[PDB]
Structure formats: structure tokens, C-alpha cells
Design a protein around this nucleic acid. Structure first.
Lengths: 94, 164, 141, 136, 38, 176
RNA sequence: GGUUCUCCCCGAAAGCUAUUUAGGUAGCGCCUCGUGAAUUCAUCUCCGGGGGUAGAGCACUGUUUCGGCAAGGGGGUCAUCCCGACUUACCAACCCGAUGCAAACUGCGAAUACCGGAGAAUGUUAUCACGGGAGACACACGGCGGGUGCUAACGUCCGUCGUGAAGAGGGAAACAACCCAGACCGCCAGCUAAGGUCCCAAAGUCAUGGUUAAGUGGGAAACGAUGUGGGAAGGCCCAGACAGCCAGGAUGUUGGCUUAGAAGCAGCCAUCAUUUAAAGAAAGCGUAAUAGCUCACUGGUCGAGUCGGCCUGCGCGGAAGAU
RNA sequence: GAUGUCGGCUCAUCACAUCCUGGGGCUGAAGUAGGUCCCAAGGGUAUGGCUGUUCGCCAUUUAAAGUGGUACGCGAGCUGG
């Protein structure tokens, strides 16, 4: 359903990951096919209000990042210890 | 957006018959009281006249999508609508059956065989004569709307400008 | 809240509205005289069964104006009467204690008709089917 | 109460939590209750929570239990000072930590389960949250 | 009334109002529902 | 928020005097019919009352409807003058006004000191019928409020002073 | 118990092990003067070397629950005693897959720490032999982590560490044991830290934006609601909302049974059917109950917000003691 | 290197989570009468027995027969079974 955008990781590590979560951004990864996994940062409150509707996971997604488009679907979610907020999400190529 | 298709559909159902009608009578109640509505449905299957209770939303959207004749000024406000495509005198008698259990001054206007029918005038049409006098009254109605009306309408506009 | 309801409902067996506790206070409270209702009501009970709840309808408006409805006997009273039964099955649909044909049913529909809303004498007949079904009458064609 | 059939030994260390849980998502049920943060439950809470859920839901589905009291906990009697050996065994404890899911259901209608888990949370010594498994 | 703590809606006409630093129940179905604190 | 967007449109020959925050409504047939807005900033325009945020507050819509309601209330107030027929049910009480004092019973040997606000006047046809007089909608209901204050309609046998909206829902006595 | 002048250079320990031993004494670690004599002794970089804890997990062991299951249990059963048995309709394991858990469990396993070599830097010896002089064993508020205790206590102990003990000053409503920092003395010099920036009393009533109205701020939890504001995504949504105020609040029907009356709302059976722009045989209230109501939903009057989810600011009562 | 203890009087004092009158909501409270019930430190709040004695147990007063602290108030006031 939803058509969203991403950046390829500027900063990587735990320290780096907390400094994205400080700015209300988070990390992800897109695995599958014959080809490498593509590591990206996302924006945190853009997807949280999408995934209130079941269509983020039921229908395929337009994710445009550095001019690449490959079509993608959501997977299982990692959440912070006492917050439902997204620490990290996985994706598979579709 | 609509939630339903119903709200757009009912506009078409009403427009079809009310554009269609050979007599109709357009009246005001805004919450008709159920007792008066049940007795008028009783009497509608007797005369074979059909009767609807209907929102001013429908009428304002109906006028936009559809032109209406001689009935279209009476679409302002809360409205019940009785209408017949067949036996036109019986259509005008059902408002005279409704006057028995309610106020008779509530009609805003009517049409009868294409003629503009004012609030007082409809009470005489609604007298509904036995059959030899009916065919004759139906012919007078029609002779008026053909050739009597032409001059008449051109006259009604000069009285409104004249000021006292 | 202003506390107004129009077309208020009251409910009493056919032979017990001569005493005041079955009628309750309300018919007196909207200003409908209890003696004139008691005299009008009695005129219609010689054919009505005792202990079977008869509808009585009062209206009050916001400005304390009031209007009042007394109705022709229920379809439930006529449907028991015509099948010769005193009272209903006490179990809706599954328990049958008699039957009513449609040609009688249409006469009943015509006898309740000023209260009935239906746009057809058939539409009105289709409304009283499910009353015959509650009291254990099977509506046979 | 949920309780162990058997345990290796009768007195075991209190233990502690470091401040994280890894079983944060629902995965055995299709909806559950998360602890939010940290604390102790005396098996007395599990039971209180199960009562609460079964009285609102009754014979509608099954309950799946994700919390377990693998530790015995001793009390020191009032007549005994410290440094005179460990206490008698008193109650069994589940050690709960931030984000541990406590109770789950799946068969029962989701809203009937939702109301059953709000009831169950008042029996608990800390603030909690409904989680649904959803599609992924 | 009972003084209580934690406010809930007892009937469809509990208005529920924060007056000073105390939440008051004022009602227009029954005066019965007039709980002093929330 | 629905009622902070109503544009009011005050009528002709009604004098609406704006002191910035203080608004005074004048016209034929009453005097001192006024409102003070303190949380929100209030424009008159030509007559179409316009609502917006005041300095040193953060809340929105909340008091902007209140202002709309309170300025319109006073515009109905000066024109016709607000409703006046007050009365009470329950034996041996009365609510007969005599001057600046309203005389009623609670069996007490002291004066009850039910007294009239500086904004109102009254007179009485009968010792249980009261006509309250003025053109500010608040003061008629303020004196109405002190008169019902310990003779409010009881929820069991209903007796009390009756004005405006009322909390009694009725119960019948126990059977005898 | 008490120990009389002063200077300077250097400067501990409260752990180990025994005691007719625990406020003692000794050996040892540790402290120092002396002669002896090796950069020995240290960090990080890289070389060489080893690990089983934390965390994490459930094959294994004791298990965990849902489902599948050899099996075990419960319950109905067959005629020709008897032996035996056709006959599951059901609960929940080891295991099996998935899910929880641990110290006496481990299929898996860091970071850091360590040593001896090779390199940079610096440290008036950290470390080394032996002669002389000891002292402490009666260490504590705190960081990491665990045992113990109620993940109480100005509580109690250890591996590991700072500070004080054995160091002045700054900071809590003065203050070295807490946070900053290392008092040689002298300078009416400046800067900066932790901590502070209306007056008390040294500095911001700060510049730009958000929000509460409680003296919350500036005292803590459960819990809770139609307390209050901001935001993007989304259903309704100017074709009429939200649903106020008015009016409708229904047809069979305010249903059958029961009964005093028995409304939807005392109780039970209804768990449905009818025209409608529209009104559920009803979400919540009430003489217990006859009664009465709000209530969605419908449409006027009339012409715009509104609710469920989530991110986010701010409140509430809960928060009652010897002066 | 402890100011020397229980009991009872005298003489007190302060905290209110008030024994009671007092203003007010609900009531399955019609009213009288009560339950439920919020505010409230102002004020009044008894005696004899047995026992060393508070407490115990009993008899009695008063509309009513309170809660908590004080080096478990007070031998540089008195008084021990």
C-alpha cells in the first residue's frame, strides 16, 4: 500500500544506533534473492502510524533508496524493552 | 466521502419517480409523528399513490443532478413527498386524507399534469369528483397548463415588483 | 438533559386497568384524565382476554402540550381468538400449539391497519407472521 | 498456581536481572501481556491473573502461559538474626525483566481477550501493556 | 457519595469536570453518583 | 471547537463596546449586560465576533467556544431580556421576596439571609410565584441559585425550588 | 587508662593462614631505613598463548505449557464362574516441533583482564635478594557484579575500584568518606569544574519554539477517567458530518410466558420480522418492582468538525502524626 | 566515666488519622430515627473495688465514655508489691 523512502546508513554500531534513536530515526535491513542484504536507516514516526493498518505487511511496498527500486515486503519486528516503539525491523525482497 | 452507497442511491430512487409524477403534493412536518405516517401509508395503498419522507440533503443534491418542473421551489426545507404517475386526482386526495389527522396549511406547492398548483388551489383538485366530472376536471387542468398558463406566468412577475 | 420523550408506552392487562397500581402514575402525570381513559378502554375489553398486555400510548412535548392514543385491539388478541386458543405457547418458533392460515391473517392485518405502517396489505401480513410464530402458531399458506 | 513439577534442588539463589529481555514479541499465542519493566511475582500473581482471565472469558479458548517460577525463595523468620544460615523455603518466584511476555491467548475473540488482560493487570505490582502478534 | 479515588462514569449523564486540583462528579441523571475525588 | 467557529453576527442598533478584553453589550431595554474574556483574545470586527490566542496562555479551542457562548448570551440578554417565571413546590416554605431579602423557612429562628445581588430586582404575584427582572442572563440564574441552594428538588419526593435544568429523575414512594 | 620540643625525606594495612583464636600474637601479603643489584614492574600497539563467566539458549539434565505422541490416568463395558478382552469419549508429560526457565543444566559464548617477546612514551624502583624497625587483623558511606536480607534498613560480605580511613578547598539549608579536584608558602590577579545564574546569596525575570495552571514544578508506587494541549497516518467527512437544540424515537408490538403491573431493563423464552430520511424487541440509569429517562440512529433549525489507534507535552487524587 | 527502673498522683503539653455538638451530599432515607458521609485542633472528655498496677474483670456516672507522641511525658516533684 504505502510508498516510503530510506537512506543507506550514514552511521553504524550501537553508539551510532542510539544517536539515530535520539533524533527519532531507526535502522533496518532488506535481505533475500541471489543478492547482498541492503542496510538502511528509516524514519521512526513515518512507519509507526502506517503499521496501525495491516496493509504495511499484507500488501507490497515501494521503498526508494539511492534511486534503487526492487519492491519489498515487511517481516518480524524488534521492539525496545519497555516501549512498543521500533528498535529495528526486518524486510525480505518481493 | 460516504460510508455507504445508500446515501447516494436514495437520491436516484426519489428523482426517478418525482420527475415522473402526473400529480404530486409537497408538504412540511420535520418529524412527521408515526401515527399520522402509518395512516397515510394505509390510505396510499387504497388510492395507489406512493409517499416518501425525505431529507433536505437529498432534495438539494436532486436539484443539482436533475431539473424538476413546478415542484422545485417546494424543495426548500423539511419535506414529505406524495406522488402518483397514474390516477392523478387520487394523488391530490391523499393530502386531503392527511388533512383529516393533521394541519392542511403545510403544503408549500404542487404540480398537477405540469401546471403550477398553489397551496389554496390544490385543495379543490383534491376534492376528487366522481367519474364524469373527473374526466372533465382533468381536461380543465390540462387546458389551463397548455394555453392559459403562458400569459399567466408573464403576469405573476409584475405583481412581485409593485410595492406598498 | 431536558428529560423529554415523545410517544411514551404503557402496558396493562385488559381487565386490571380499573385499579391504579397496574396503570402506574404516568397517565395521570402527562395530564390525560384517568377516568375518561378508564371509560373509553372498557368499551373494547369484552372480547379481550384477561392478563394479556394491551398497548396504551401517551405523548408529551417539551412545552408540556400533550396528545393521547387509544388503539383498536392487538393482532395478538385476534390471532389467539381466531385459532380458539386462550394463551400462547410461551416458547418462540420451536414449540407449536396451533396454526393460522394467511387468508385470516390478511383480515387481521386490515383490522390493525390505522396503527400498521405497511405500504402494502401484504407488507402488513409479513409483519404479523413473526407474532404468530412467538405465540406457537404456524403460518401455513 | 503454575508451579514446577520438580526442581533440581530445594533452595536456590534469588538471582537478578541486568535490565533486558529478548522474548519481547508474541510468538506462541496471537496476542499477550508484556511486563513493560522489571520485578518479582510470588506465583500468587500468576494465579490471580489466571482467575481474572478465566472468569471474564470462561470456556472460550485456552490460555497459554509464558511466565514460570523456576526459583524457590526463602524467608528469614523474625526470631533469627543474619549470619545463622539461610531461612526456611516460603514462596516460589518468577523473576521478571523488561519486556518479558506474561500471559497469552489466541482462540478467544481478541476484544474478549483484551478486556480479560486489563482486568489481569491490576493484580500485578507494575504497569503493563497489551501486545498483538499481528501479520509479522 | 463515597469519597474514593479513581473516577469512572456511573451513568450517561456524569459530566466529569476538573474543578480546582480535585476531579468532581456532577450528574444530571441521579445525584447518587457524586463522587468527591478522582 | 464547533462553537469557537460560529461567527455570531450581532443585530443592528446593538452597541458592542470593546475595551480590548472587556466587552459591554448595550441596546434598547436593558443596562450593564457585559462579559470579560481572560484566557482568549476576542475581536468584535463590525459585528462578526472573531476568536484567537491570547498572550501568556497555551490552550486552544477550550475557552474560545466559552467566549462565543458568553458574548452571544449577553446579545440575547439586552434585546428581549431573559426568562423570568420562577416558582417552587413544597408546603410551608414560600419564596416571597420582600425588598432586598427573600423569606423562606428551614424552621430556623435566625434569618436565613437569602439576599438579592446588586444586578437584579424582583416582584411577586403570589407568595410562591416570583418574577425576577433584569437583562444580564447570569444574575437571574445567580439569585435563582442561592434560592434553591438548600431547597433543591429532592430525588425521592421531588419538593424544591424549580429553575432551569434540574437533576430529579423520579422514584415513587414505597407501597403501603 | 596515660606518654611532655621540633624539623625534613619517605610512607601502610584491615586480605591470607593457625590458635584455649577474632579489640591479642605470629608467619605471609603490604610500609620503611640499609647494603645488594636487575629496568626488573606498568599501560597501549602488534606477536605468541590459554579460557568457560556474563549474556544467550532449550538438543541434554530437572523441566515449562500448547499441539502431535509410544505410554500413563479417568470413565462407560462383554459372556461361558474363570482366565481374559472387543470397546476413547477424555486429561496432561518425557519426547517431538514451537514457547518459557536454572546454580547442583549447557548444543553456544563475548568484551575486558592476563602473561612472556617486539615497539612508543614516561614514571627519583611499581617489582627483586638479604640485615634492621614496624604496623593492621576492631575498615566504612559509594561505583560493576553477586551471595545474604523483603533486588527493607544510616543493613552485611567478598572478587574488582575510587574517595576517606592516612588531603585542604567547591557543591546538599558549611562539608575530605558521594560528585569535582590534589591543600609547599606568598599574590584585594585571571580562567574553569562538579554545582549555580529574580532577592536572601556570586552570575540568564536568556534568545527561538512546545505545554501545564498543579505552587505540579520543587515528595514515591498501584490505579484510573469524556482533566488538557500539540502532531503526522487513517475511517466518518461541506453529497450535511459530530450529532446539540427541536422534532421522530418507530410497524407486528413495548412480543410470548410468568404476573401486581411484567417495560428491553423483576424473570425467562425471544437471539425475529415491517414501511421509513429514521429510531436497537436496547448500551447505561432508576419506587428492588407498577413508572419515568438518557441513549445511538434519522432529519430539520442548518453548515463543521469528530472518533479509534500511535508518537508527544502537561495535570489530577491516591500523598494523614508528638516542636 | 549509665542523670537511677515499673506502678500510682500531681502538674502538663503537642499531632489529628476527631469521642461528641456543629454546616452539607447520598440513602435500598417519605417524615421522626438511623446507615452511608465530607469539613473541622476550637472546646469539654468522670469514679470506686480487688491486684504493685496501666491493661484485666465488675459496678456506676455522663448527651457522649476518644486516637497518637513526649529519655514508653514528669524521683536536680512525690511516692516500690
Amino acid at each position: 500500500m504505502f510508498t516510503i523512502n530510506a537512506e543507506v546508513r550514514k552511521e553504524q554500531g550501537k553508539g551510532a544506533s542510539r544517536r539515530l534513536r535520539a533524533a527519532n530515526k531507526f535502522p533496518a535491513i532488506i535481505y533475500g534473492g541471489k543478492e547482498a542484504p541492503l542496510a538502511i536507516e528509516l524514519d521512526h514516526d513515518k512507519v509507526m502510524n502506517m503499521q496501525a493498518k495491516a496493509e504495511f505487511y499484507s500488501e507490497v511496498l515501494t521503498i526508494v533508496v539511492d534511486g534503487k527500486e526492487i519492491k519489498v515486503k515487511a517481516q518480524d519486528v524488534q521492539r525496545h524493552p519497555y516501549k512498543p516503539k521500533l528498535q529495528h525491523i526486518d524486510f525480505v525482497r518481493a | 466521502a460516504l460510508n455507504l452507497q445508500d446515501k447516494q442511491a436514495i437520491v436516484a430512487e426519489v428523482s426517478e419517480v418525482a420527475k415522473g409524477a402526473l400529480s404530486a403534493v409537497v408538504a412540511d412536518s420535520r418529524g412527521v409523528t408515526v401515527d399520522k405516517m402509518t395512516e397515510l401509508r394505509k390510505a396510499g395503498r387504497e388510492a395507489g399513490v406512493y409517499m416518501r419522507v425525505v431529507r433536505n440533503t437529498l432534495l438539494r443534491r436532486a436539484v443539482e443532478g436533475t431539473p424538476f418542473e413546478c415542484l422545485k421551489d417546494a424543495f426548500v426545507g423539511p419535506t414529505l413527498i406524495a406522488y402518483s404517475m397514474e390516477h392523478p386526482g387520487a394523488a391530490a386526495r391523499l393530502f386531503k386524507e392527511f388533512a383529516k389527522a393533521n394541519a392542511k396549511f403545510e403544503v408549500k406547492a404542487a404540480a398537477f399534469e405540469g401546471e403550477l398548483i398553489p397551496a389554496s388551489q390544490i385543495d379543490r383538485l383534491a376534492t376528487l369528483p366522481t367519474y364524469e366530472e373527473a374526466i372533465a376536471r382533468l381536461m380543465a387542468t390540462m387546458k389551463e397548463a397548455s394555453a392559459g398558463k403562458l400569459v399567466r406566468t408573464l403576469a405573476a412577475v409584475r405583481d412581485a415588483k409593485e410595492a406598498a | 438533559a431536558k428529560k423529554v420523550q415523545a410517544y411514551v408506552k404503557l402496558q396493562v392487562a385488559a381487565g386490571m386497568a380499573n385499579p391504579s397500581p397496574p396503570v402506574g402514575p404516568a397517565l395521570g402525570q402527562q395530564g390525560v384524565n384517568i377516568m375518561e381513559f378508564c371509560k373509553a378502554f372498557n368499551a373494547k375489553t369484552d372480547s379481550i382476554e384477561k392478563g394479556l398486555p394491551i398497548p396504551v400510548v401517551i405523548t408529551v412535548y417539551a412545552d408540556r402540550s400533550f396528545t393521547f392514543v387509544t388503539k383498536t385491539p392487538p393482532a395478538a388478541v385476534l390471532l389467539k381468538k381466531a385459532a380458539g386458543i386462550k394463551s400462547g405457547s410461551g416458547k418462540p418458533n420451536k414449540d407449536k400449539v396451533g396454526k393460522i392460515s394467511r387468508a385470516q391473517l390478511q383480515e387481521i392485518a386490515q383490522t390493525k391497519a390505522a396503527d400498521m405502517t405497511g405500504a402494502d396489505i401484504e407488507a402488513m401480513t409479513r409483519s404479523i407472521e413473526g407474532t404468530a410464530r412467538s405465540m406457537g402458531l404456524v403460518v401455513e399458506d | 498456581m503454575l508451579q514446577p513439577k520438580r526442581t533440581k534442588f530445594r533452595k536456590m539463589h534469588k538471582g537478578r536481572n541486568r535490565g533486558l529481555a529478548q522474548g519481547t514479541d508474541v510468538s506462541f499465542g496471537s496476542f499477550g501481556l508484556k511486563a513493560v519493566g522489571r520485578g518479582r511475582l510470588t506465583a500468587r500473581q500468576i494465579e490471580a491473573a489466571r482467575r481474572a482471565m478465566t472468569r471474564a472469558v470462561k470456556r472460550q479458548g485456552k490460555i497459554w502461559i509464558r511466565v514460570f517460577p523456576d526459583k524457590p525463595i526463602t524467608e528469614k523468620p523474625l526470631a533469627v538474626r543474619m549470619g545463622k544460615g539461610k531461612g526456611n523455603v516460603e514462596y516460589w518466584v518468577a523473576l521478571i525483566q523488561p519486556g518479558k511476555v506474561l500471559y497469552e491467548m489466541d482462540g478467544v475473540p481478541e476484544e474478549l481477550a483484551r478486556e480479560a488482560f486489563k482486568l489481569a493487570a491490576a493484580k500485578l505490582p507494575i504497569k503493563t501493556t497489551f501486545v498483538t502478534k499481528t501479520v509479522m | 457519595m463515597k469519597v474514593r479515588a479513581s473516577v469512572k462514569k456511573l451513568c450517561r449523564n456524569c459530566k466529569i469536570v476538573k474543578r480546582d486540583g480535585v476531579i468532581r462528579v456532577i450528574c444530571s441523571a441521579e445525584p447518587k453518583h457524586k463522587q468527591r475525588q478522582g | 471547537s464547533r462553537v469557537a467557529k460560529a461567527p455570531v453576527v450581532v443585530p443592528a442598533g446593538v452597541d458592542v463596546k470593546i475595551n480590548g478584553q472587556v466587552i459591554t453589550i448595550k441596546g434598547k431595554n436593558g443596562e450593564l449586560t457585559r462579559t470579560l474574556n481572560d484566557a482568549v483574545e476576542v475581536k468584535h470586527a463590525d459585528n462578526t465576533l472573531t476568536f484567537g490566542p491570547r498572550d501568556g496562555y497555551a490552550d486552544g479551542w477550550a475557552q474560545a467556544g466559552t467566549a462565543r457562548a458568553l458574548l452571544n448570551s449577553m446579545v440575547i440578554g439586552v434585546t428581549e431580556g431573559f426568562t423570568k417565571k420562577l416558582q417552587l413546590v413544597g408546603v410551608g416554605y414560600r419564596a416571597a421576596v420582600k425588598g432586598n431579602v427573600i423569606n423562606l423557612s428551614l424552621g430556623f429562628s435566625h434569618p436565613v439571609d437569602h439576599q438579592l445581588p446588586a444586578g437584579i430586582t424582583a416582584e411577586c404575584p403570589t407568595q410562591t410565584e416570583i418574577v425576577l427582572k433584569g437583562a444580564d442572563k447570569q444574575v437571574i440564574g445567580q439569585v435563582a441559585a442561592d434560592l434553591r441552594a438548600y431547597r433543591r428538588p429532592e430525588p425521592y419526593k421531588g419538593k424544591g425550588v424549580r429553575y432551569a435544568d434540574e437533576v430529579v429523575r423520579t422514584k415513587e414512594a414505597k407501597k403501603k
